[PDB]
Structures are given as structure tokens and as C-alpha cells.
Amino acid sequence: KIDLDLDDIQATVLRERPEPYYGTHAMVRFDTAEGGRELLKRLLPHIASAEKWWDVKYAWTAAAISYEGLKKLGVPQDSLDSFPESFKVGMAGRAEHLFDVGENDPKHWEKPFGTGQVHLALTIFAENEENWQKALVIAEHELEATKGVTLLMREDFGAQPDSRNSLGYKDMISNPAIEGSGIKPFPGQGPAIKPGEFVLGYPGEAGVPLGMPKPEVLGKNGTFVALRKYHTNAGSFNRYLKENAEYTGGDAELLAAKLVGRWRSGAPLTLAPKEDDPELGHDPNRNNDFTYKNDPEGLEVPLGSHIRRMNPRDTKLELLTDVNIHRIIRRATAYGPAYDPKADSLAEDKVERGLYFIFISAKAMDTTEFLQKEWINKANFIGQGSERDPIVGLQDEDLTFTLPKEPVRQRLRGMDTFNVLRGGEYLFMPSLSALKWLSELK
Ligand code: HEM
Ligand SMILES: [Mg+2]
Ligand SMILES: [Mg+2]
Ligand SMILES: [Mg+2]
């Protein structure tokens, strides 16, 4: 059944990223309360809802608002107080619960981020360059027309060869299935998570709705967003694959597969353990149909590989854990020059490429802080001590990655931080009704 008011929920909460994809991220500041309210009234016609999210849509526009954004809009103090504390503090201010330290410390963040300047994040997704522009010109026009707001930054994304990300992996394969979305999960995508884990106003896994913003028109059919921008050091990554390829029989593509858990083509190593299977990788009805019940030792998908860290499935962990409450919906967008596998100079790390991530969840701040602190930058849950995620963890050359083989558990060292945080924000992705309410304040 459809249990979700799809016509009130923003499209981005349920729509997969288009294939191929083009778009733009835009960070906006509200100079005056009335400027903010007006921008929303002008954008609101162009914010698509999640109606028939399984159908084709050549472009849609998303909007998500920071605490500072809500404050400036004039949201009353008793409504501001109903948002979680983490959201109030903002992402930079919560760096300690995110292990955003070292290279990722907020003092190094790119300009708009981490300062409270970002009030409104606008994202345009599109499947061809023509509808990207059509929606872009519409966005730019309404911005120009709104005195009282200024566009802080703007960056285009997508147009990647074969849609691969900034390290050449097929991304956007595994996202949680939502009970009540109207669509049965792809094989191996189950189980359908209770809808209140991802949309406010609805029961979660524990049977009751999560704490949500007040009044009901502001919080219902909304959700929370963790937006993070990374810079990718593909030079360092490439040199790492070459240096350590001896440990996977000279095959650098197998080593790239062991660090993520999937070949760059998308095939998971549980379904393609010895050689790539690019047709498997491209097929949504095949590329996710697996668990780890027959791989308890990480011989196929290593325990500390990226996808297995982020979604352990039936892996035995240290402490009891309901994986269902630690899921996140991801929208990844690669930006910058396309990834090149032969490029391994030091200067390749200086090419401005990377990823934007929009992580969506009714408790997005909690789950992002949880994943960052417990499953990316530690390995106690998998019994590998201080090993950290090879793709996005804050690496130290003397930390290791354990690559299980026959009959020896090989250890690798000398990793650099391959994806460096350039900034981020905790945002609130409001319902279509809540957006209208915000535009009619005061
Ligand atoms: C920063 C650079 C990152 C890169 C290059 C990257 C890349 C990937 C790739 C290639 C996959 C496999 C494709 C797929 O399963 O859809 C994946 C899966 C996943 N990643 Fe990341 N990712 C990054 C950051 C993050 C972060 C910060 C998080 C969470 C805090 C995250 C959470 C996940 C999850 C939940 C999955 C799905 C696992 C599953 O259901 O099997 N990723 N990522
Ligand atoms: Mg949307
Ligand atoms: Mg490259
Ligand atoms: Mg960059």
C-alpha cells in the first residue's frame, strides 16, 4: 500500500538519482525575513512532490533549510525549540560527535559552510542537459527577482562518463526500502523499513513516530538532511591501488573492489568474487541480491570494507544491533573533472573533483553522527580494533585495512584520507505544506 502522503512529501525523499544525471547545488542566504518568505513562495510552484516517484521525471528541484534559515524566516521560538539540539548547533558545531577533526576539522572548510551563512540549500536534479537548464533558468530567475536573498555559492554536478563517481565506482545501488512507498523492494533490498525512520509524522521500527517539529504542519511529511561536500584525492587513491595491488594478485581492480566491497562496475564481491561481472553490476534486479551469511570471515566482502561497514546486513557484530535504525537514504552527486584511472601524479590530487552527499532520514543528524563515530572511524563493531573506513575515514598511514585471504589475513597500511570533508550542514527538508506555511509567516 501507499501509506505516505506522497503529494505532500518532497520528491527527493523518494526519487532515485536520475541516470545519467546533471544538476546544480545552490546555497542561499536570507538577508531579510520577507526576502526568505518570498523566495519560498516563488519556488514552491517548482518543488515537485513524491507523487508517482517510480515514474520518469526529467527534472525536479529540492529545498532544505538550516536552523539559521528557519530563525531568519521568523519561525517562532517555540517551533525553533522543537528541532533537535544537534540541528540547532549545526554540523560544524557538532564536529566532535562526527569525528570531523584533523583534515576534516571545520576550520579548513570551504567558505559558505560551517558559518551559519547557509539558510537554504537548493538542488536541481535532471536526466538530460536540456531539462537541467530549463529548471536552472527558472531557479536563477526567481533568485534574481527576490531582493532580500543573495546566492552564496553555486556548483554544477553530474555529466560524469557512465555516471561513475569521482573514484570511478558505480554508486547509488543500495538505498533502504520504505514500507508504504507503494513499491516492493529490488531483490536483496529488503526488508522495507518502517516509514517513520525516514519521514516525520509516521511510525518507525519501534511502532511510534519519532520526535518531530511543531506545529504539525511544519514537521509532518518532512525529514532531515545531512549535506556534506568532499574533495577526492584520486591521485593518492590511484597510487595506493598500484602500490598495494600485489596483495590481490597484481589486479588493481580487485583491490578497488575489496576496499568498497563492489567492483567499480557495481558487481558485489559476494556475487562476483574472482572476476568482474559488469552486466551483473548494471542490473538493479541482480546487483543487490545478497547477504553476508555465507561470508562470515570477509573472504569475499572484507568486514572493514565500505559497504559492509555502512550496511552490515546479517554480519555478526560485537554488540546487538538493529541495523534497521541505522539506515540512511543517500543522494550522491559527483562534481569536477571525470575520474581518470591512469592519472597518478601528486598534482592529480589538486584537481577540483569530488562528491556532494545528501543523506536523508527522520533522524539524519543522529544516524550521520552514529555512522561517522562508530562505523567509519572505529572498527570495534567488526572486531578489527582501530581500523577505519578505507574510502571516507580519517586515515593515518600506520592504521591498517584487513584483507582476508587463504590462508592468511593480510594487512595493508599507508592509506591517505581519500575523501576530505570540504563542508556540510544539517538541513530540514520540509513538506510541500510546510514550505507554504513558511512562506506565509508574519
Ligand atoms: C566520501 C566518499 C564516499 C564514496 C566515494 C562512497 C562510495 C560508495 C560506493 C561506491 C558505494 C557502493 C554503491 C552502493 O552500494 O550504492 C557506497 C555504498 C554506501 N555508502 Fe558510501 N561513499 C562515500 C561516503 C559515504 C558516507 C560519508 C556514508 C555514510 C555516513 C556512506 C554510506 C554508504 C551506504 C549506507 C552505502 C550502502 C551500503 C549498502 O546498503 O550495501 N558513504 N558508497
Ligand atoms: Mg525535492
Ligand atoms: Mg583521476
Ligand atoms: Mg573539490
Residue numbers in the entry: 19 to 460
Show sentences the authors wrote.
Dye-decolorizing peroxidases (DyPs) are heme proteins with distinct structural properties and substrate specificities compared to classical peroxidases. Here, we demonstrate that DyP from the extremely radiation-resistant bacterium Deinococcus radiodurans is, like some other homologues, inactive at physiological pH. Structurally, DyP-type peroxidases also differ from the classical peroxidases. In contrast with the α-helix rich structures of the latter, DyPs are organized in two domains with a ferredoxin-like fold of four anti-parallel β-sheets surrounded by α-helices. A sequence analysis of DrDyP compared to four characterized and structurally determined members of the class V peroxidase family of DyPs, demonstrates that the proximal His heme ligand, and the four residues that are proposed to form the hydrogen peroxide binding pocket within this family of DyPs are conserved in DrDyP (H324, D189, R348, L373 and F375).
DrDyP possesses one and DrDyPM190G possesses two molecules in the asymmetric unit, respectively. The final model of DrDyP (residue 19–460) contains one heme molecule, two glycerols, three Magnesium ions and 45 waters. In total, DrDyP contain 12 α-helices and 10 β-strands, with the β-sheets located mainly in the interior of the protein and the α-helices on the surface of the protein. A superimposition of the two structures demonstrates that they are almost identical with an RMSD value of 0.28. The assumed catalytic residue in both structures (Asp189 and Arg248) and the axial His324 are well-aligned relative to the heme. Interestingly, we could observe one hydroxyl group and one water molecule within the hydrogen bonding distance to the iron and the catalytic Asp189 and Arg248 on the distal side of the heme for DrDyPM190. This was not observed for the DrDyP structure and can most likely be explained with the lower resolution of this structure.
